[PDB]
Amino acid sequence: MKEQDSEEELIEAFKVFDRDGNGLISAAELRHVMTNLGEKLTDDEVDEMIREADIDGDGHINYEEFVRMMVSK
């Protein structure tokens, strides 16, 4: 139920996910974190997660998209 308030935490995950520190998560950046976190994902499996989060259709997950993906059911 607590999603909108997760901002405090969801915001911390960004800095950890964004290795480039540019403010944008790509398919290669996300998959990179999943590996270290302990999750194996293929180039296709990852790309499928990016599109679901990509609201602008640019191929990158931003802050507004990060919360949406987390607050998606």
Binding site: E9, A13, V16, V33, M34, L37, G38, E39, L41, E48, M49, E52, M69, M70, S72, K73
Partner: peptide
């Protein structure tokens, strides 16, 4: 094709859960 709209969400949700359980040492 099943899309995995729900399953895909768990893969990301679970991944974050571990990060919290690890970071959130509490004590």
């Amino acid at each position: 094709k099943r899309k995995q709209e729900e399953v895909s969400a768990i893969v990301i949700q679970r991944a974050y859960r571990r990060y919290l359980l690890k970071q959130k040492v509490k004590k």
